[PDB]
């Protein structure tokens, strides 16, 4: 019978050490079966529904909970909500500001004047003069991300408790909701990487034969259309400037990690998508979408909202990138998307719970696969 229960975290490898402390290697997550079985159920029919599926809600809840617990014991940055004296960095003849703070030291009677660099996106002016505030002081306290904790996605298997089973649909063309004819039983799912992104889905599983378009109600413009690609497109992303990290004491064993001086040239973060692969991929998506509308299909840049929705938000290397995709949703060159980086984050629309992402020294290079798109809709077009 159909049921909703508690599933457990399982992983493939125990190759993860205790230095990295990956949140998806919690040491509270069990190993899975190294030689898993799958039983094909012959002569059965099962109705699957991805939009009403409760495994999705449970995965979502586990992730939010995991992040809150991981950040629970780490340093609070409420002492930094002080007037910031900021000027531009010597990237002169943009987006990085050199700010001075008055910070209480381990001895409560004294404050020290210290400096840090901030990205423009994290700092809001108070005055028309050189007087600024961090963007969160207006709404919430910031918890500093734990400097020793990796948030790199590790494939997680969701496995059934005793008395329960997980059915898998093996119809290659299965789309949204409806019957699946080839059904099999497993103890658990394949590993799923908990990758966070907003416009382009990264590092997922590709469709077996063709682009598959999935929606709850394809005629409702308010619904997200999830497009699964049958071929991946690579993205090369980087953070080209060499950062340094400045450790600032803000209390008795309470350390704040500030961006220190930038070494060498100051350059803009960016992502590289091959033009030819993108062109055929986006055109194939328009072709497949057409089968459900019979209209000419075109793409446009997003309409507006905050950066999480208007840009391709993603994490890479622990850094948080917001890339401009107007050049995608519109030769043999490479499409280079400018990207911005920010450290003060409110994940999953949970306004009121801010996080500060400490700087990473050195340079960052990312390689990732676009495996799908999240699209919405607004004529013979």
């Amino acid at each position, epitope marked *: 019978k159909d049921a909703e229960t508690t599933l457990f975290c399982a992983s493939d490898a125990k190759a993860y050490d205790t230095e990295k402390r990956n949140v998806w290697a919690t040491h509270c997550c069990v190993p899975t079966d190294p030689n898993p079985q799958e039983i094909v159920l012959e002569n059965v029919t099962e109705n699957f529904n991805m939009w009403k599926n409760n495994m999705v809600e449970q995965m979502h809840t586990d992730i939010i909970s995991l992040w809150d617990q991981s950040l629970k014991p780490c340093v609070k940055l409420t002492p930094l909500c002080v007037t910031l004296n900021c000027t531009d960095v*010597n990237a*002169t003849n943009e987006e990085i500001k050199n700010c001075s703070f008055n910070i209480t030291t381990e001895l409560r009677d004294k404050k020290k004047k210290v400096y840090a660099l901030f990205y423009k996106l994290d700092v809001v002016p108070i005055d028309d003069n050189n007087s600024y505030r961090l963007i969160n002081c207006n709404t919430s306290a910031i918890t500093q991300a734990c400097p020793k904790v990796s948030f790199e996605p590790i494939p997680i298997h969701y496995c059934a408790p005793a008395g329960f089973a997980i059915l898998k649909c093996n119809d290659k063309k299965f789309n949204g909701t409806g019957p699946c004819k080839n059904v099999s039983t497993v103890q658990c799912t394949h590993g799923i990487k908990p990758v966070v992104s907003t416009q382009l889905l990264l590092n997922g599983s590709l469709a077996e034969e063709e682009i598959i378009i999935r929606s709850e109600n394809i005629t409702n413009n308010a619904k997200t259309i999830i497009v699964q690609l049958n071929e991946s497109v690579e993205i090369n992303c980087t953070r080209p400037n060499n950062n340094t990290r400045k450790s600032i004491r803000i209390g008795p064993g309470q350390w704040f990690y500030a961006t220190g001086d930038i070494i*060498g*040239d*100051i350059r*803009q973060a960016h992502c590289n998508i091959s033009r030819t692969k993108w062109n055929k991929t986006l055109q194939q998506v328009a072709k497949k979408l057409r089968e459900h509308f019979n209209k000419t299909i075109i793409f446009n840049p997003s309409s507006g909202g905050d950066l999480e929705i208007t840009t391709h938000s993603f994490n890479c290397g622990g850094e948080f990138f917001y890339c401009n995709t107007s050049e995608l949703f519109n030769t043999n060159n490479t499409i280079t998307l400018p990207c911005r980086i920010k450290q003060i984050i409110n994940m999953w629309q949970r306004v009121g719970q801010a996080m500060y992402a400490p700087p990473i020294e050195g340079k960052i290079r990312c390689t990732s696969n676009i495996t799908g798109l999240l699209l919405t809709r607004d004529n013979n077009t």
Partner: antibody, heavy 131, light 108 residues
């Protein structure tokens, strides 16, 4: 070859306008960038400014308000004019050809590059003093 | 303004000029013999215009925190001169004034 021959009054008075020229021979005045260099006696030289066609002219910010440069396409001369002459303007003045290149350090599309200039053919220069 | 280097004929001289770099640089070096207009030795760190021998070779503009250096190997008596650098640094305003030079004295 290219010869640049400077010419001027030699001695001018304070608050007078100084006007120097440069007879260009072997090239046409609009073929390259021109620049003027000033070397106070015993000091390292200063770049006064550079002039070219298409409006690509700029001046040393410390002099800019008192300086004008131009190309005479009829006489194939390069001119330099300094107003408000003072004690600080006593120097050797030189006419030189300017060539350039580009240094790229990042993404070209993001303008992560700069133009640099160097002086190739130098004239002999003239000595200009004030009193 | 100038500093000094004393080099015996045939020895290598090391001439430095300018402050520590911040970003990528294109350094231009000029040589001034007494009584003469200065002339170009190298541009873009290592590019010699025709007529300049390969005994004149500069430091790269690819690193940071260093200073411009012109190495003159096998110094000849004819190399006695005031050497100046003009530093174009990607993180600083155009430098309209050449840096203070070095007088290279050949001890001949």
């Amino acid at each position: 070859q290219v010869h640049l021959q400077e010419s001027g009054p030699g001695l001018v008075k304070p608050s007078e306008t100084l006007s120097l020229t440069c007879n260009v021979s072997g090239t046409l005045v609009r073929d390259n960038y021109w620049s003027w260099i000033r070397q106070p006696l015993g000091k390292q030289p200063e770049w006064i400014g550079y002039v070219h066609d298409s409006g690509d002219t700029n001046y040393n910010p410390s002099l800019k308000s008192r300086v004008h440069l131009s190309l005479d396409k009829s006489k194939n001369l390069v001119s330099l004019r300094l107003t408000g002459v003072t004690a600080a303007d006593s120097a050797i003045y030189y006419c030189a050809t300017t060539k350039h290149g580009r240094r790229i350090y990042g993404v070209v599309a993001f303008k992560e590059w700069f133009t640099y200039f160097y002086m190739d053919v130098w004239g002999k220069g003239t000595s200009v003093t004030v009193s | 303004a100038p500093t000094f280097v004393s080099v015996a004929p045939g020895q290598t001289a090391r001439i430095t000029c300018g402050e520590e770099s911040l970003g990528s640089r294109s350094v231009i070096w000029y040589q001034q013999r007494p009584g003469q207009a200065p002339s170009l030795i190298i541009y873009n760190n290592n590019d010699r215009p025709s007529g300049i021998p390969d005994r004149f070779s500069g430091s790269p503009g690819s690193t940071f925190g260093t200073t411009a250096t012109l190495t003159i190997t096998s110094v000849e008596a004819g190399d006695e001169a005031d050497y100046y650098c003009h530093i174009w640094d990607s993180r600083r305003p155009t430098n309209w004034v050449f840096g203070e030079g070095t007088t290279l004295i050949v001890l001949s």
